[PDB]
Design a protein around this ligand. Structure first.
Ligand SMILES: [Mg+2]
Ligand SMILES: [Mg+2]
Ligand SMILES: [Mg+2]
Ligand SMILES: [Mg+2]
Ligand SMILES: [Mg+2]
Ligand SMILES: [Mg+2]
Ligand SMILES: [Mg+2]
Ligand SMILES: [Mg+2]
Ligand SMILES: [Mg+2]
Ligand SMILES: [Mg+2]
Ligand SMILES: [Mg+2]
Ligand SMILES: [Mg+2]
Ligand SMILES: [Mg+2]
Ligand SMILES: [Mg+2]
Ligand SMILES: [Mg+2]
Ligand SMILES: [Mg+2]
Ligand SMILES: [Mg+2]
Ligand SMILES: [Mg+2]
Ligand SMILES: [Mg+2]
Ligand SMILES: [Mg+2]
Ligand SMILES: [Mg+2]
Ligand SMILES: [Mg+2]
Ligand SMILES: [Mg+2]
Ligand SMILES: [Mg+2]
Ligand SMILES: [Mg+2]
Ligand SMILES: [Mg+2]
Ligand SMILES: [Mg+2]
Ligand SMILES: [Mg+2]
Ligand SMILES: [Mg+2]
Ligand SMILES: [Mg+2]
Ligand SMILES: [Mg+2]
Ligand SMILES: [Mg+2]
Ligand SMILES: [Mg+2]
Ligand SMILES: [Mg+2]
Ligand SMILES: [Mg+2]
Ligand SMILES: [Mg+2]
Ligand SMILES: [Mg+2]
Ligand SMILES: [Mg+2]
Ligand SMILES: [Mg+2]
Ligand SMILES: [Mg+2]
Ligand SMILES: [Mg+2]
Ligand SMILES: [Mg+2]
Ligand SMILES: [Mg+2]
Ligand SMILES: [Mg+2]
Ligand SMILES: [Mg+2]
Ligand SMILES: [Mg+2]
Ligand SMILES: [Mg+2]
Ligand SMILES: [Mg+2]
Ligand SMILES: [Mg+2]
Ligand SMILES: [Mg+2]
Ligand SMILES: [Mg+2]
Ligand SMILES: [Mg+2]
Ligand SMILES: [Mg+2]
Ligand SMILES: [Mg+2]
Ligand SMILES: [Mg+2]
Ligand SMILES: [Mg+2]
Ligand SMILES: [Mg+2]
Ligand SMILES: [Mg+2]
Ligand SMILES: [Mg+2]
Ligand SMILES: [Mg+2]
Ligand SMILES: [Mg+2]
Ligand SMILES: [Mg+2]
Ligand SMILES: [Mg+2]
Ligand SMILES: [Mg+2]
Ligand SMILES: [Mg+2]
Ligand SMILES: [Mg+2]
Ligand SMILES: [Mg+2]
Ligand SMILES: [Mg+2]
Ligand SMILES: [Mg+2]
Ligand SMILES: [Mg+2]
Ligand SMILES: [Mg+2]
Ligand SMILES: [Mg+2]
Ligand SMILES: [Mg+2]
Ligand SMILES: [Mg+2]
Ligand SMILES: [Mg+2]
Ligand SMILES: [Mg+2]
Ligand SMILES: [Mg+2]
Ligand SMILES: [Mg+2]
Lengths: 62, 158, 183, 53, 149, 98
RNA sequence: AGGUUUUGCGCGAGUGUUUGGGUGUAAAACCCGCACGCGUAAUGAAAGUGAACGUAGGUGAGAGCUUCGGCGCAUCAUCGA
RNA sequence: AGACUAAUCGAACCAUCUAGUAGCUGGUUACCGCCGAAGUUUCCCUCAGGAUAGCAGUGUCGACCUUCAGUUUUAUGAGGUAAAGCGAAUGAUUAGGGACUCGGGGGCGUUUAGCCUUCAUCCAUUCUCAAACUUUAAAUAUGUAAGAAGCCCUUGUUACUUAACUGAACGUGGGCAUUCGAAUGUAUCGACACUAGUGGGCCAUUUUUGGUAAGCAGAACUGGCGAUGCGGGAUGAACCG
RNA sequence: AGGUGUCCUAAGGGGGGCUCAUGGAGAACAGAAAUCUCCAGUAGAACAAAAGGGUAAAAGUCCCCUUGAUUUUGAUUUUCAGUGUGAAUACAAACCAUGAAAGUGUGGCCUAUCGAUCCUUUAGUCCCUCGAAAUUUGAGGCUAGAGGUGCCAGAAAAGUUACCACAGGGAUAACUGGCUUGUGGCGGCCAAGCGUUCAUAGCGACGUCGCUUUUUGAUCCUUCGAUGUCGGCUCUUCCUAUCAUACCGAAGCAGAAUUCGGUAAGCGUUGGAUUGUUCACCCACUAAUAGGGAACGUGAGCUGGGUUUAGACCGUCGUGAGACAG
RNA sequence: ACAUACGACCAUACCUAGUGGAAAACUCGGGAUCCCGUCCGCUCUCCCAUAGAUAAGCCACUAAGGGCGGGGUUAGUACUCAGGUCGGUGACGACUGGGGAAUCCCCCGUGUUGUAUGU
């Protein structure tokens, strides 16, 4: 027999029952999808920055 | 019925009246940085890098910069949750957003207001207030005699 | 009507231990009194952790204690509301004073042989009623086989429920491109 | 019919397994019988050890 | 009730019939009140209305509990950092819309009034202008407060 | 669809790793072997009584096939396969239009 | 019977006596150990190979301690090994 | 005659396999307390059924972090519906005028641009229209933002980029507040685990589509009944309170 | 209202020169239309194919060169469970095409043009295994394509039952009732026209407003653990939209006979041939032989003529079993 | 201020018609060996900067010019959000609290500006 085809009648209320969850933002976003050349350079830039920061405490004194 | 990619984009993706043809080059001359806030507006004359019709008229944050396109983060409402979508959009469909210009002008105005208030010894108001009810005032009818109005009688005009 | 979204909402945290251990009940009474009559947040944290289930009190090993004993923490009293276990990988146990819910036999023996000291939580309450000069440690909560299975789904890299491991168990059609698609 | 995240069931009970269930309520009685047999055979092998080298 | 007026009434703290609140008139509050016009009657209170509301139906929100204002110690304990240490101070702050009006009004638990002693107009769910009781009746809310309080 | 008899494209051959010339032919499926494990299992299952033990497809719907180009490198004879779209009529080396 | 998650227990890098043996006030209780199961290492179809640059790393948080300078549990995000 | 074969025949009777299977019908046993739905998404020889997500309960844990919001304000984007238009494009359509010289036909005094006429074209006007027309273009509704993960100064790293330290990204060090940079609320924030029922819906305002219409069939938003008593509408699932 | 299962070595890629549909003037054959020239010409052309966007020193058109329709693996977008599949977008590894370059190019300007497991067949290498040890055949693995499931998330599949069976369904048809009233029936308003003369004695077009539920449709709300399904006979009552009878008004009412209308359902409305009929049509009488409802009134009232299970015949149909609102 | 080159906005800049244009620039211009390309040195390419001319391009001004742009009027009209046990047989309408258009028509205007080198 025939029946109802489709409906969105109750969906808004069901969605709002426990709130519309918006994923919280973070200080450091994922570098996924970023330009691989930029990622490759950024890796070594971070390496050098950490090395320089450690030498600063150990006697480099920048 | 159909559910193709560009279904229902007859007017949204079309170029306006007397807006066809050559694309201004300031679009290509603009520069974008990661973290910039951009408005997405699909240009119908550029079929490469076209975002889906959902992202037309949406505002997002640039998360990736490439040769001729930018990656934009948008938040899309599906069912009871928000999904973080990442779209690669060519520059022709991207415009820098004024959605933060008021705040970006207010921050520096507040900085100067703070330094001037500290110099002058009197605090000022940094936060914006909503429109307040009008204060008491006097209206003089000298040379402004009120004009008495009455409702007009009905008559046909055809 | 009053038009409230929430009514009769119960607190979602434990208010007492589900355990029937008599000595744990006595310890809970002691630390209830301490948390009521002292300003120290340490006592309240200890009291709340005394209610917790075993999976909420993962074990802390001697090596985990030794990691946190570094960088100016050598003379602090280590407080673990959990079981303290031994670690074979740690060959030299540093001198330490540890108060824990319980110790394994090997952990207690090695702590005492290294010149250290072992305390119960009531002894800790006696000597440091406010938790002064204490280092409060927790074990790895997620380091558990069951957690590896939680949230299994596409592109989530969790552990599936399988009876065995091998080429014939969940490794074809849905896991490689040579068999249709991968996950 | 699976309904959640379950390990795929493979319980081999599709035959008439109840027809061949082997309980072990006779474990202590069988142990007693074994001890009695051992004692009897040790008595029979009066000075000899109960086993072979 | 539609969800937007429901949310606005929840934000105005008018969660129950015959609940009453003091609101400082700005554009932001006026627009919300205009939206929830089909559910509220509002107006301009006088000193007598403010005084009697605070004195008879005055309850403070102390640690999430509704505590009657039977002593000045409660008011000093919960509003003393703003210079409000007495019920007359609270009345003055509300009536004059002082710099700490937000704190004073939010400290006041929403007033729980009775039905008016003389009743409402013959049909109370029209606008006051149409002959009902909804909307802005301006100074005429003082008679309604006197009946409802 | 008309494709040329030759084309130069990337060659994965260990010595080439480079765009080289390739001769183009049409891939043809080889004759089915009687000693493949699937064929052996099918014969063993079909032996005896029981009738047809595996499904036999009947509801054919395609009127075309995907043409596969077999490319043979001119320097190392390394072979590569390039699938094309479905087309009813296919020829290679046909006369060009004017 | 098998599986799973969550409670409460014992022991804990181990754990499980009870297939079996010893013993008995005799289907109980008590005692014993070789093997074995699970765990301690993964990955690949397989041959096979097999986990520290760092005080077991850096950044942002983070309860609790602090000699008030920072030390930073669990956990989360992130860049690395 | 599908007739008869012990009141049994389109395959007798007896026992067993067998407690055969059933997405189908019926039933399913004390009390109180708290919370509390769905008839919708995707896939299925799926359409009286399942799985999947959603709605729900319970158990927790985390600093319950000073954040969160079916809301307003302010600033800034997108849209092509209502309306409007056709002396604006496309398409439809009613009427006359001005001329053309001819543009077709037919004539009058024949290469006479002779003089007429009947249409056609053109032109400046005119009446009326469009779900698959539009130069315009609302209301409602919708994206983003309103700080500490911010702002300002100085100079460190790189294998990327630039002609180049010149940029990009991430930082060190220093500074800000006589005010953490709209309103209102916060009568609850977040994460995790396991699982129930449901997956026939129906009614109403507004907007509607098919239909002559229907207590008809199908949709969008919201509110209801289902799951709900009470006052009113005499009488009632939905109406008013 | 339509479209798709294709088609293209160019209709893919790069570069350059040019500007299209059409109109007005002109030029032997030549005219409405062949070619040539100029001037206008916002695209009114063209771009494989539906429609909608888009494009003018191009995305059109012609010319030159080519194979980016290539290799490798990820990220993202739409449909979405944020799973497949199909499509699509930006970037990296490479080595190629083209232009002096800049740059562009990962098939078709964009929105459709397609396919899992198992099996099979190819392509790929000093690759792995055949488990007592070797070599050579053979076989089996790993990575990437192809052979196809159009019911397109993908079974291998002809009928009949009137001899029929079971679990159910009023989620779903046939009969009553319910809503509706297109259709059927019955009225009104207007009044061109007819009526010798005269629109309105009496008819009456085009249009338009209604009523009724004695037609038939439309719907599927009630009933499928059953409300006995046509007609007739018998019997009672009700309705009025009156056939006759009572009393009235109007006429194209001299009388007679008629016609129209009002108050009116009190009282009647028949006997037969044919047909199961309903409906109908004839014969005849009569004041008249009006129309309807009451679960299409009425089967524990009848009857069983009709519909009509099982027997049987014919015609048409079917290979057949069998079908037929014959 | 004017000219040129490269632009930005992309008609207030377009289209039609008339008048005028210091200096320099731009332009038309002359020749066809070489480079190059055509049916044709028309275009493109090369060479000359002498000569001639502002006729055209270009610039400026003009036109109760067409168009375009801005404003008004249309109009608090059309429309629309929320409300009532409002009206009306209905179609639909009015009112309450808000938001609020578009033609015809009328008036004004007909480019602004950056970098560099020049007059
Ligand atoms: Mg059905
Ligand atoms: Mg359904
Ligand atoms: Mg919940
Ligand atoms: Mg109550
Ligand atoms: Mg993914
Ligand atoms: Mg294969
Ligand atoms: Mg395969
Ligand atoms: Mg059985
Ligand atoms: Mg009274
Ligand atoms: Mg009243
Ligand atoms: Mg073979
Ligand atoms: Mg045989
Ligand atoms: Mg069990
Ligand atoms: Mg062991
Ligand atoms: Mg191994
Ligand atoms: Mg702290
Ligand atoms: Mg028969
Ligand atoms: Mg018998
Ligand atoms: Mg018989
Ligand atoms: Mg038989
Ligand atoms: Mg039997
Ligand atoms: Mg409740
Ligand atoms: Mg199937
Ligand atoms: Mg049922
Ligand atoms: Mg439109
Ligand atoms: Mg539309
Ligand atoms: Mg309209
Ligand atoms: Mg028109
Ligand atoms: Mg037209
Ligand atoms: Mg329209
Ligand atoms: Mg708008
Ligand atoms: Mg907005
Ligand atoms: Mg469920
Ligand atoms: Mg379903
Ligand atoms: Mg379900
Ligand atoms: Mg239903
Ligand atoms: Mg309906
Ligand atoms: Mg229905
Ligand atoms: Mg129900
Ligand atoms: Mg109710
Ligand atoms: Mg009632
Ligand atoms: Mg009803
Ligand atoms: Mg169709
Ligand atoms: Mg093309
Ligand atoms: Mg080409
Ligand atoms: Mg080309
Ligand atoms: Mg070109
Ligand atoms: Mg076009
Ligand atoms: Mg070449
Ligand atoms: Mg996809
Ligand atoms: Mg494409
Ligand atoms: Mg490239
Ligand atoms: Mg395939
Ligand atoms: Mg097959
Ligand atoms: Mg194979
Ligand atoms: Mg071998
Ligand atoms: Mg096949
Ligand atoms: Mg399917
Ligand atoms: Mg029904
Ligand atoms: Mg009718
Ligand atoms: Mg008449
Ligand atoms: Mg009917
Ligand atoms: Mg029915
Ligand atoms: Mg029935
Ligand atoms: Mg019944
Ligand atoms: Mg009966
Ligand atoms: Mg009869
Ligand atoms: Mg009558
Ligand atoms: Mg009569
Ligand atoms: Mg009678
Ligand atoms: Mg009837
Ligand atoms: Mg009947
Ligand atoms: Mg009867
Ligand atoms: Mg009967
Ligand atoms: Mg009958
Ligand atoms: Mg009969
Ligand atoms: Mg018969
Ligand atoms: Mg018959």
């Amino acid at each position: 027999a025939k029946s109802k085809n489709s409906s969105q009648h109750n969906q808004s209320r069901k969605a709002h029952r426990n709130g519309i969850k918006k994923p919280k933002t973070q200080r450091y976003p994922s570098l996924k999808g970023t330009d691989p050349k930029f990622r490759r350079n950024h890796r070594h830039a971070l390496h050098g920055t950490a090395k320089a920061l450690k030498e600063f405490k150990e006697g480099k004194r920048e | 019925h159909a559910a193709g990619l560009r279904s229902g984009t007859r007017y949204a993706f079309s170029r306006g009246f007397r807006k066809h043809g050559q694309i201004p080059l300031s679009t290509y001359l603009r520069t974008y940085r990661v973290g910039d806030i951009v408005d997405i507006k699909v240009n119908g004359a550029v079929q490469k890098g076209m975002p889906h019709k959902f992202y037309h008229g949406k505002t997002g944050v640039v998360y990736n910069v490439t040769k001729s396109a930018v990656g934009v983060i948008v938040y899309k409402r599906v069912k009871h949750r928000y999904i973080e979508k990442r779209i690669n959009v060519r520059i022709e469909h991207v415009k820098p957003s004024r959605s933060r210009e008021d705040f970006l002008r207010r921050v520096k105005e507040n900085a100067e207001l703070k330094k001037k208030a500290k110099a002058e010894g009197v605090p000022v108001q940094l936060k914006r207030q909503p429109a307040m009810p009008r204060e008491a005032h006097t209206v003089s009818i000298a040379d402004n005699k009120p004009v008495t109005l009455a409702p007009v009688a009905y008559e046909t005009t055809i | 009507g009053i038009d409230l979204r929430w009514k009769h909402v119960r607190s979602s945290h434990r208010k007492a231990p589900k355990s029937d251990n008599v000595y744990l009940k006595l310890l809970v009474k002691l630390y209830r009194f301490l948390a009521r009559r002292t300003e120290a947040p340490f006592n309240k944290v200890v009291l709340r952790r005394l209610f917790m289930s075993r999976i909420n009190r993962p074990p802390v090993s001697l090596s985990r204690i030794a990691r946190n004993l570094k960088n100016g923490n050598e003379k602090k009293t280590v407080v673990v509301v959990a079981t303290v276990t031994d670690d074979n990988r740690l060959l030299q146990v540093p001198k330490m004073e540890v108060a824990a819910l319980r110790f394994t036999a090997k952990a207690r023996a090695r702590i005492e042989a290294a010149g250290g000291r072992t305390l119960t939580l009531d002894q800790l309450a006696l000597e440091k009623p406010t938790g002064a000069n204490t280092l409060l440690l927790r074990g790895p909560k997620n380091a558990r086989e069951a957690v590896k299975h939680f949230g299994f789904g596409p592109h989530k890299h969790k552990k599936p429920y399988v009876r065995s491991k091998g080429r014939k168990f969940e490794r074809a059609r849905g896991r490689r491109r040579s068999r249709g698609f991968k996950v | 019919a699976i309904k959640h995240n379950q390990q795929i069931p493979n319980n081999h009970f599709r035959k008439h397994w109840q027809r061949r269930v082997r309980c072990h309520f006779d474990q202590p009685g069988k142990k007693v019988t074994r001890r009695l047999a051992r004692r009897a055979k040790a008595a029979a092998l009066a000075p000899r050890p109960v086993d072979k080298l | 009730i539609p969800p937007k007026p429901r949310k606005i009434l929840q934000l105005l703290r008018l969660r129950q019939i015959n609940n009453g609140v003091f609101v400082k008139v700005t554009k932001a509050t006026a627009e919300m009140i205009k939206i929830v016009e089909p559910w509220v009657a509002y107006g301009y209170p006088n000193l007598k209305s403010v005084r009697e509301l605070i004195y008879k139906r005055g309850y403070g929100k102390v640690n999430g509990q509704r505590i009657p204002l039977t002593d000045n110690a409660i008011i000093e304990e919960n509003l003393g950092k703003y210079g409000i240490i007495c019920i007359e101070d609270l009345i003055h702050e509300i009536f004059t819309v002082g710099p700490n009006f937000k704190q004073a009004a939010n400290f006041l638990w929403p007033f729980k009034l009775s039905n008016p002693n003389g009743g409402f107009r013959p049909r109370k769910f029209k606008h006051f202008i149409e002959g009902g009781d909804l909307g802005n009746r301006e100074e005429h809310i003082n008679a309604l407060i006197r009946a409802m309080n | 669809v008309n494709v040329p008899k030759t084309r130069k494209t990337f060659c994965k051959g260990k010595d080439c790793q480079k765009h080289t010339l390739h001769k183009v032919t049409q891939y043809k499926a080889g004759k089915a072997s009687a000693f493949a494990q699937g064929k052996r299992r099918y014969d063993r299952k079909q032996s005896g009584y029981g009738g047809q033990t595996k499904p036999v497809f009947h509801k054919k719907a395609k009127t075309t096939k995907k043409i596969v180009l077999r490319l043979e490198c001119s320097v190392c004879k390394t072979k590569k396969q390039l699938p094309l779209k479905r087309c009813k009529h296919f020829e290679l080396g046909g006369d060009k239009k004017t």
